[PDB]
Scaffold this active site. Structure first.
Site, PDB file in Angstrom:
ATOM      1  N   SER A 392       0.851  -1.179   0.000  1.00 57.42           N
ATOM      2  CA  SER A 392       0.000   0.000   0.000  1.00 57.42           C
ATOM      3  C   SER A 392       0.891   1.235   0.000  1.00 57.42           C
ATOM      4  CB  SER A 392      -0.905  -0.014   1.241  1.00 57.42           C
ATOM      5  OG  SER A 392      -1.652  -1.227   1.327  1.00 57.42           O
ATOM      6  N   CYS A 561      -7.401  -0.497   7.363  1.00 56.75           N
ATOM      7  CA  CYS A 561      -6.256  -1.095   6.701  1.00 56.75           C
ATOM      8  C   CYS A 561      -5.444  -1.998   7.616  1.00 56.75           C
ATOM      9  CB  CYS A 561      -5.350   0.007   6.142  1.00 56.75           C
ATOM     10  SG  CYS A 561      -3.899  -0.618   5.288  1.00 56.75           S
ATOM     11  N   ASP A 606      -8.623  -2.045   2.917  1.00 56.39           N
ATOM     12  CA  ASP A 606      -7.339  -2.349   2.304  1.00 56.39           C
ATOM     13  C   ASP A 606      -6.710  -3.298   3.306  1.00 56.39           C
ATOM     14  OD1 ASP A 606      -4.996  -2.452   0.839  1.00 56.39           O
ATOM     15  OD2 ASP A 606      -4.192  -0.577   1.617  1.00 56.39           O
ATOM     16  N   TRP A 608      -5.268  -7.383   4.261  1.00 48.81           N
ATOM     17  CA  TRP A 608      -4.574  -8.516   3.680  1.00 48.81           C
ATOM     18  C   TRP A 608      -4.214  -9.523   4.764  1.00 48.81           C
ATOM     19  CZ3 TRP A 608      -2.333  -3.509   4.033  1.00 48.81           C
ATOM     20  CH2 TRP A 608      -1.245  -3.384   4.923  1.00 48.81           C
TER      21      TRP A 608
HETATM   22  C1  LIG Z   1      -3.527  -5.569  -1.324  1.00 48.39           C
HETATM   23  C2  LIG Z   1      -2.458  -5.879  -0.491  1.00 48.39           C
HETATM   24  C3  LIG Z   1      -1.816  -4.867   0.213  1.00 48.39           C
HETATM   25  C4  LIG Z   1      -0.710  -5.158   1.006  1.00 48.39           C
HETATM   26  N1  LIG Z   1      -0.065  -4.171   1.645  1.00 48.39           N
HETATM   27  C5  LIG Z   1       1.024  -4.449   2.375  1.00 48.39           C
HETATM   28  C6  LIG Z   1       1.701  -3.429   3.034  1.00 48.39           C
HETATM   29  O1  LIG Z   1       1.450  -2.250   2.791  1.00 48.39           O
HETATM   30  N2  LIG Z   1       2.709  -3.739   3.955  1.00 48.39           N
HETATM   31  C7  LIG Z   1       3.060  -5.074   4.188  1.00 48.39           C
HETATM   32  O2  LIG Z   1       3.833  -5.353   5.103  1.00 48.39           O
HETATM   33  N3  LIG Z   1       2.413  -6.094   3.483  1.00 48.39           N
HETATM   34  C8  LIG Z   1       1.376  -5.776   2.596  1.00 48.39           C
HETATM   35  N4  LIG Z   1       0.838  -6.738   1.835  1.00 48.39           N
HETATM   36  C9  LIG Z   1       1.370  -8.116   1.937  1.00 48.39           C
HETATM   37  C10 LIG Z   1       2.452  -8.304   0.872  1.00 48.39           C
HETATM   38  O3  LIG Z   1       1.867  -8.208  -0.429  1.00 48.39           O
HETATM   39  C11 LIG Z   1       3.163  -9.650   1.027  1.00 48.39           C
HETATM   40  O4  LIG Z   1       2.206 -10.712   1.053  1.00 48.39           O
HETATM   41  C12 LIG Z   1       3.980  -9.641   2.322  1.00 48.39           C
HETATM   42  O5  LIG Z   1       4.828  -8.490   2.339  1.00 48.39           O
HETATM   43  C13 LIG Z   1       4.825 -10.915   2.402  1.00 48.39           C
HETATM   44  O6  LIG Z   1       5.472 -11.119   1.143  1.00 48.39           O
HETATM   45  P1  LIG Z   1       6.860 -11.925   1.030  1.00 48.39           P
HETATM   46  O7  LIG Z   1       7.106 -12.190  -0.405  1.00 48.39           O
HETATM   47  O8  LIG Z   1       7.894 -11.202   1.804  1.00 48.39           O
HETATM   48  O9  LIG Z   1       6.540 -13.314   1.777  1.00 48.39           O
HETATM   49  P2  LIG Z   1       6.129 -14.627   0.943  1.00 48.39           P
HETATM   50  O10 LIG Z   1       7.366 -15.296   0.485  1.00 48.39           O
HETATM   51  O11 LIG Z   1       5.115 -14.238  -0.062  1.00 48.39           O
HETATM   52  O12 LIG Z   1       5.428 -15.533   2.074  1.00 48.39           O
HETATM   53  C14 LIG Z   1       4.159 -15.162   2.617  1.00 48.39           C
HETATM   54  C15 LIG Z   1       3.509 -16.379   3.280  1.00 48.39           C
HETATM   55  O13 LIG Z   1       4.326 -16.900   4.337  1.00 48.39           O
HETATM   56  C16 LIG Z   1       3.447 -17.591   5.242  1.00 48.39           C
HETATM   57  N5  LIG Z   1       3.709 -17.018   6.581  1.00 48.39           N
HETATM   58  C17 LIG Z   1       3.946 -15.592   6.877  1.00 48.39           C
HETATM   59  N6  LIG Z   1       4.197 -15.654   8.331  1.00 48.39           N
HETATM   60  C18 LIG Z   1       4.029 -16.910   8.741  1.00 48.39           C
HETATM   61  C19 LIG Z   1       4.152 -17.415   9.967  1.00 48.39           C
HETATM   62  N7  LIG Z   1       4.680 -16.604  10.880  1.00 48.39           N
HETATM   63  N8  LIG Z   1       3.870 -18.692  10.251  1.00 48.39           N
HETATM   64  C20 LIG Z   1       3.424 -19.527   9.221  1.00 48.39           C
HETATM   65  N9  LIG Z   1       3.312 -18.970   7.942  1.00 48.39           N
HETATM   66  C21 LIG Z   1       3.630 -17.685   7.730  1.00 48.39           C
HETATM   67  C22 LIG Z   1       2.030 -17.274   4.782  1.00 48.39           C
HETATM   68  O14 LIG Z   1       1.539 -18.305   3.914  1.00 48.39           O
HETATM   69  C23 LIG Z   1       2.231 -15.989   4.001  1.00 48.39           C
HETATM   70  O15 LIG Z   1       1.169 -15.850   3.045  1.00 48.39           O
HETATM   71  C24 LIG Z   1      -0.246  -6.467   1.094  1.00 48.39           C
HETATM   72  C25 LIG Z   1      -0.897  -7.481   0.399  1.00 48.39           C
HETATM   73  C26 LIG Z   1      -2.003  -7.191  -0.392  1.00 48.39           C
HETATM   74  C27 LIG Z   1      -2.669  -8.216  -1.054  1.00 48.39           C
END
Ligand SMILES: Cc1cc2nc3c(=O)[nH]c(=O)nc-3n(C[C@H](O)[C@H](O)[C@H](O)COP(=O)(O)OP(=O)(O)OC[C@H]3O[C@@H](n4cnc5c(N)ncnc54)[C@H](O)[C@@H]3O)c2cc1C
Ligand SMILES: Cc1cc2nc3c(=O)[nH]c(=O)nc-3n(C[C@H](O)[C@H](O)[C@H](O)COP(=O)(O)O)c2cc1C
Ligand SMILES: Nc1ncnc2c1ncn2[C@@H]1O[C@H](CO)[C@@H](O)[C@H]1OP(=O)(O)O
Length: 609
Positions: A392, A561, A606, A608
């Site tokens: 966001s 949010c 907003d 997630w």
């Molecule tokens: C519309 C929208 C807005 C968003 N805005 C933001 C934002 O502004 N700021 C922000 O921080 N994120 C936001 N996100 C989330 C962001 O898009 C990512 O999903 C997040 O940052 C993690 O991505 P990554 O690739 O680092 O982790 P990834 O490699 O994608 O892994 C994520 C997955 O790890 C698993 N996981 C996470 N923690 C644990 C846990 N502790 N124990 C077990 N499983 C776990 C879950 O399955 C999680 O879905 C937003 C998501 C959406 C959809």
């Protein structure tokens, strides 16, 4: 609006296909499902093909009856109650058309998430609409729930779908089959090798606007700092320089980024399979008629594929493990992998606990089932595509037209698999250090989360933790409007964190805005500074009188949010109670009143997971 391809029906005829599976997808899941269904056709004497509804005119559905025993399947995901971008065309057509689909046979599998307001809205709509137009349903509507386990819902539906299809068309249910062929390139010139770009070869090097999902802008990371004090978590703020990109945005929009997987993880996958990751090659579709020539940008090295184009961290879906079972020399391991695709029993339980719950990634499985040694090229054909991550935008373009701000928490946790899992996009972003500058391939996606058109309309913002992101932008803009001489209504922030001196994000900036009057109220819930949990909804309950006044008399806009899991619903319930008391009115009417605020654009989300 893309140029449509020639009639998909005429294409089916020329290629002997009798089933077409369309996919309404944004993060590639529906497309994955469509491809699996299309392939299944083969195992039943039929022949199918997957297809992007956007590249076609669905009106041609009325011609499908010209193919004997024909069938169309729709695997459609829902996004914020609407169709996915690629299916918006289909949706509009479905609404305006009056074409007769007599003779058409269909089936729909909706991908959705029960936690949202409009669960599987698109799948439900398509399934109902085709019937109204005269088409006949061959199998019940599938309702996948990503909040439980979408993969299992799909397996279940699919297991009953095919027998139903076979029974109706009088077809029989009658092996390993590659979709692509490997072509190593020894005499390959460097200028023709993909190194991680998404669209045109060298699009990352030679940047040409306009920039989007297919042609992201590589933004320079000008700032990247830690926001919290503790060491349990890593919350960060980054500033991406978008100067000269001609990219426009507004507070409330989201910025997407294409990250790189962990190099050590990529290295080990090659090392464990004994493969040379630096081999330059291409994977070419064995179906010379498909528009999908490769699974990802080719030619390229395996290393590059595993680093930029493939998902190597998320728990593999059952068909991937199923297809890999052939490469496990230990019978017990081949049997386990084979049974992961079961719709019930130990095989299913093992998949849900050993793979999903444990969060085992592909390398983990390769290590835990050491007899599993698939050829690198086949593994690359099986892995899903690496998706962009959304954030966001935490800044206002009225104040920072040439910079996009991100506020996020780094993901890193101990998985039951026995290892520490790292978030792909956040580990990558965290590593980006300002000033060979650090570049982030990105693009902006417009959203409907916006400040009111009228500066005088009151704003109620609720975003604990990283949920504060869009609001830093809102606040910057509202302060700006005031500095410009505009008449600004109340601007209320309900924020929350554990402790004032530990994770009070943007504490300094928020203090400043409050001091200057940009922030009418800065209500912060410090959840751990006392025995009881104190959350944002508790402060809303505290200020129930005034908030009702702003909502009932001032036409205030509500914004929520952050955490969609529990925070969003708790906050929504508190609003139900505020309305029920001051309306006054029964819970039932309070709920309708609040959901009506959402449709009237005065309660925006907003959230997630
Ligand atoms: C519309 C929208 C807005 C968003 N805005 C933001 C934002 O502004 N700021 C922000 O921080 N994120 C936001 N996100 C989330 C962001 O898009 C990512 O999903 C997040 O940052 C993690 O991505 P990554 O690739 O680092 O982790 P990834 O490699 O994608 O892994 C994520 C997955 O790890 C698993 N996981 C996470 N923690 C644990 C846990 N502790 N124990 C077990 N499983 C776990 C879950 O399955 C999680 O879905 C937003 C998501 C959406 C959809
Ligand atoms: C920003 C966002 C909004 C979503 N909104 C909805 C929604 O309104 N209704 C629903 O049923 N599912 C919703 N989902 C869940 C998706 O429909 C589900 O995860 C689907 O499996 C994604 O498919 P895809 O990979 O083919 O796009 C949403 C997911 C995201 C990320
Ligand atoms: N259900 C909920 N409703 C509102 N805030 C919540 C919440 N669950 C956790 N929080 C709080 O959201 C803030 C950001 O994560 C934290 O202060 C967290 O408090 P906690 O972690 O002490 O429970």
């Amino acid at each position: 609006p893309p140029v449509k391809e020639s009639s998909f029906v005429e294409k089916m005829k020329k290629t002997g296909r009798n089933i077409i599976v369309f996919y309404g997808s944004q993060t590639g899941t529906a497309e994955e499902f469509a491809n699996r269904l299309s392939k299944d056709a083969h195992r039943y004497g039929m022949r199918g093909m997957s297809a992007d509804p956007e590249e076609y005119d669905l009106a041609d559905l009325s011609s499908l009856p010209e193919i004997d025993k024909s069938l169309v399947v729709f695997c459609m995901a829902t996004y914020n109650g609407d169709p996915t971008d690629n299916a918006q065309d289909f949706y509009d057509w479905l609404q305006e058309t009056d074409v007769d689909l007599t003779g058409v046979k269909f089936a729909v599998f909706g991908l959705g998430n029960k936690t949202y307001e409009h669960f599987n809205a698109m799948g439900k709509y398509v399934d109902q609409r085709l019937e109204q137009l005269g088409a006949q349903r061959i199998f019940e509507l599938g309702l996948g729930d990503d909040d439980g386990n979408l993969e299992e819902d799909f397996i279940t539906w699919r297991e009953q779908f095919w027998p139903a299809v076979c029974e109706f068309f009088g077809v029989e249910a009658t092996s390993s089959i590659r979709q692509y062929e490997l072509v190593v390139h020894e005499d390959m010139d460097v200028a023709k090798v993909y190194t991680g770009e998404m669209g045109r070869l060298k699009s990352y090097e030679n940047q040409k606007p306009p920039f989007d999902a297919k042609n992201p802008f590589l933004a320079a990371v000008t700032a990247n700092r830690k926001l919290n004090q503790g060491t349990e978590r890593h919350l960060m703020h980054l500033e991406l320089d978008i100067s000269d990109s001609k990219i426009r945005y507004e507070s409330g929009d989201h910025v997407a980024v294409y990250p790189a997987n962990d190099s050590a993880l990529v290295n080990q996958i090659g090392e464990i399979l004994g493969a040379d990751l630096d081999v330059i090659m291409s994977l070419n579709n064995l179906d010379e008629e498909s528009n999908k020539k490769h699974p990802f940008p080719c030619p390229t090295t395996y290393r590059t594929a595993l680093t930029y184009y493939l998902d190597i961290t998320n728990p593999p879906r059952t068909n991937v493990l199923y297809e890999l079972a052939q490469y496990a020399s230990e019978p017990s391991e081949q049997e386990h992998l084979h049974k992961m695709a079961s719709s019930s029993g130990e095989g299913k339980e093992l998949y849900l606990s050993w793979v999903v719950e444990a969060r085992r990634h592909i390398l983990a499985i390769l290590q835990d089932y050491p007899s599993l040694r698939p050829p690198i090229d086949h593994l690359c054909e099986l892995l899903p595509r690496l998706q962009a991550r959304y954030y966001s935008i935490a800044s206002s373009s009225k104040v920072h037209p040439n910079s996009v701000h991100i506020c996020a928490v780094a993901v890193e946790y101990e998985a039951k698999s026995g290892r520490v899992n790292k978030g792909v996009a956040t580990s990558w972003l965290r590593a980006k250090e300002p000033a060979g500058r650090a570049l982030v391939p990105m693009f902006v996606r417009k959203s409907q989360f916006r400040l009111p058109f009228k500066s005088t309309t009151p704003v109620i913002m609720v975003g604990p933790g990283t949920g504060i992101a869009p609001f830093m932008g809102f606040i910057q803009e509202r302060a700006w409007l005031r500095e410009q001489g505009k008449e600004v209504g109340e601007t209320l922030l309900y924020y929350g964190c554990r402790r004032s001196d530990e994770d009070y994000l943007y504490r300094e900036e928020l203090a400043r805005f409050h001091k200057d009057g940009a922030l009418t109220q800065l209500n912060v819930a410090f959840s751990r500074e006392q025995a009881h949990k104190v959350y944002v909804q508790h402060l809303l309950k505290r200020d129930r009188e005034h908030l009702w006044k702003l909502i009932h008399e001032g036409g205030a806009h509500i914004y929520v949010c952050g955490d969609a899991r529990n925070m969003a619903k708790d906050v929504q319930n508190t609003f139900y109670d505020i309305v029920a008391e001051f309306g006054p009115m029964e819970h039932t009417q309070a709920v309708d009143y609040v959901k009506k605020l959402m449709t009237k654009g005065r309660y925006s989300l907003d959230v997630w997971s």
